[PDB]
């Protein structure tokens, strides 16, 4: 956390 968690 979609950064890619």
Given at each position: ?5
């Amino acid at each position: 956390x979609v950064x890619x968690x």
